[model samples]
Target: GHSKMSDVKCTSVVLLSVLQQLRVESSSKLWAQCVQLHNDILLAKDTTEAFEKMVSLLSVLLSMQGAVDINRLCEEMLDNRATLQ
Candidate 1:
């Protein structure tokens, strides 16, 4: 649990860094495209659709090495929950 939340935080950081690098390497247009796709997933009409979108996104993200640090993510989530209490 301790590791979990930290893992989450690490994963978030990695993902953001990856996105920033991608933006720099690509173009603003590509960044906008990514955001639009994310928005589309958020706007899914039902739980099934939302889940499908989430899975698709996960697949894409996971394809990138270092996109997630599962242990750190779990730790970070646990830390956040503790802070909430």
Candidate 2:
């Protein structure tokens, strides 16, 4: 049975997707961070790794500056796997 469907493939949305979900993309600073995150998550090879990275990013970017309802966005990131889209 080792040869029976021994592999699985999955994809996770980049941090940019999560940011878009919250309507972000106004401030240049946030844009910079999201751009980095976009590449980082894009480069990630695993779904869970990228998902955790996005959640970590949401936790890090909270209240640094700019925007509202950031917590709501963060919660969505943590709560929903497909919200990244």
Candidate 3:
């Protein structure tokens, strides 16, 4: 389970989790895209690429959810890096 713990990877996943908790209406496309981001995260060469991939997924969440949840997600992503790693 050595999914590389890049900043972007961590952000997207915790964001995705928050989206799920809030019942973000996950369309098929969102699910697939998020899945692929996670896969890319696993293979990400460095923080930059991982962060870029995460930024791409962040767009999906922006539409799929709202701002407040993402704010919360950010806090947790930082707080829970050990768990994420």
Q: Write the per-residue lDDT of candidate 3 for residues 9-84, one digit (tens) a residue.
A: 3544554564454445565565555655654564565665554444445544555444455545563453354232
Best by TM-score: 2
lDDT of 1 by residue, 1-85 (tens): 4322233233334323434444234334544444345434433656455424433443334324344553345434333534311
Candidate 3 pairs with clashing backbones: none
lDDT values, one for every candidate = 0.39, 0.51, 0.50
Quote each prediction's TM-score: 0.27, 0.43, 0.34
Per residue, candidate 2 scores C-alpha lDDT tens digits across 29-75 of: 65556445534463365756665665556454655645566666656
**lDDT over C-alpha atoms for residue 6 of model 1:** 36
> Which candidate should be chosen as best, given lDDT against the real structure?
2
Off by over 4 Å in 2: 1-14, 67-69, 79-85
lDDT of 3 at 71: 40
Answer with 2 or 3, whichever has the higher lDDT.
2
Error of 2 at 74 (Å): 4.0
What alpha-carbon RMSD in Å does predicted model 1 have with respect to the real structure?
A: 13.7
